Design a protein around this ligand. Structure first.
Ligand SMILES: O=C(O)CNC(=O)C(=O)O
Ligand SMILES: [Cl-]
Ligand code: NI
Length: 365
């Protein structure tokens, strides 16, 4: 008999499986050591676990900040996406209704809130992303504060999961990288490397009518188990395919960001998303716009490289080429209609592409 992902049975089985430890792949790093230098030296190609907040410049509430508080600072009448884990189906309800379910006994259902972005609430002031995320983030660095398009609202999520909840394998929208901090409880991540065949396997699995009856990790070479405990912060690189299990009631904060070390993976994940035609529910809003602003940054970085005769690092040049190809793809007569909606004001894509192409040729000398 086919077992639904997320079902009691499925979790009992999952808890019994053995996985390779993330000892192999996930670096343990002191907060004050997670610098742009470390990132640039290692390339952010593997998840990073920071055991203690110290040095991250991460601001989060004391661990004595409960779901009941979330209800207060966010708003009990706030509409929120609740995931029914057993049905692996979603629905909407007032926060107050979820929080009421959360505190009941005996809980019949297994429900999660994993899409609750609170940067537009009073609770926003209680959480500040780590310094390294602010340094890496495209939006943070290159999106003008007076822009007419709203910044992507993906920087502050509150995740509330009950014991025995399960989030199925996925790549985060836009191939965005993530910071994920467990305030209370713990979270188990099953991490899959975004090797080319793994990505291809994921796309095929994710679009099969029966994907919620198939355990994706059975299809890959290695699925690493990483347990993130209370107070620890996990950073997930671009493109990683992953799932989570919640062994005890968990409260966590997370944020998503794009950056210059994974321009290719970001575009490839985006392209995968495009084809899957999934719900905009989790999509990375104005992903294209972020890329546009990055493209203008690169142009300026190139022009600035001429005043000093100093080259731009190879990853930026390659990045520029990938972005430029995207820009061209997005501004094709036919395509302009769909993608113009994310074009920043006062942008002339033609001159941008031309100027970038030219400036890439020059660096290719
Ligand atoms: O909290 C969970 O278990 C699931 N969270 C995510 O997959 C995420 O924040 O992108
Ligand atoms: Cl970003
Ligand atoms: Ni996710």
């Amino acid at each position: 008999k086919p077992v639904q992902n997320g079902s009691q049975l499925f979790i009992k089985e999952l808890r019994s499986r053995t996985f390779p430890s993330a000892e192999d792949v996930v670096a343990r790093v002191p907060g004050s050591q997670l610098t742009l230098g470390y990132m640039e030296e290692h390339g952010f190609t593997e998840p990073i676990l920071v055991p203690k907040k110290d040095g991250l410049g991460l601001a989060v509430p004391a661990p004595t900040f409960y779901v009941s508080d979330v209800e207060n600072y966010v708003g009990p009448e706030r509409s929120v996406d609740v995931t029914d884990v057993t049905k692996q189906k979603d629905c909407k309800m007032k926060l107050k209704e979820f929080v009421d379910y959360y505190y009941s006994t005996n809980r019949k259902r297994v429900l999660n809130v994993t899409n609750l972005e609170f940067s537009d609430t009073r609770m926003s002031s209680f959480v500040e992303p780590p310094d390294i995320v602010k340094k890496l983030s495209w939006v943070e660095n290159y999106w003008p504060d007076d822009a007419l398009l709203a910044k992507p609202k993906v920087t502050k999520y509150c995740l509330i999961c009950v014991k025995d909840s399960y989030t199925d394998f996925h790549i985060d929208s836009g191939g965005a990288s993530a910071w994920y901090h467990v305030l209370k409880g713990e979270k188990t991540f099953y991490l899959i490397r975004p090797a080319s065949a793994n990505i291809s396997l994921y796309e095929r699995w994710r679009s099969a009518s029966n994907h919620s009856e198939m355990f994706f990790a059975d299809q890959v070479d290695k699925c690493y188990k990483c347990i993130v405990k209370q107070g620890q912060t996990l950073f997930i690189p671009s493109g990683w395919i992953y799932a989570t299990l919640t062994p005890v009631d968990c409260l966590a904060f997370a944020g998503h960001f794009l950056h210059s070390l994974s321009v290719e993976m970001q575009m490839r994940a985006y392209e995968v998303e495009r084809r899957l035609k999934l719900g905009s529910l989790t999509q990375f809003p104005n992903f294209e716009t972020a890329c546009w602003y990055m493209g203008k940054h690169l142009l300026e970085a190139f022009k600035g490289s001429h005043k000093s005769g100093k080259q731009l690092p190879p990853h930026l040049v390659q990045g520029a080429k990938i972005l430029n190809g995207a820009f061209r793809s997005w501004t094709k007569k036919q395509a302009l209609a769909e993608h113009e909606d994310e074009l920043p004001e006062h942008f002339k894509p033609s001159q941008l592409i031309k100027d970038l192409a030219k400036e890439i040729r020059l660096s290719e000398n």
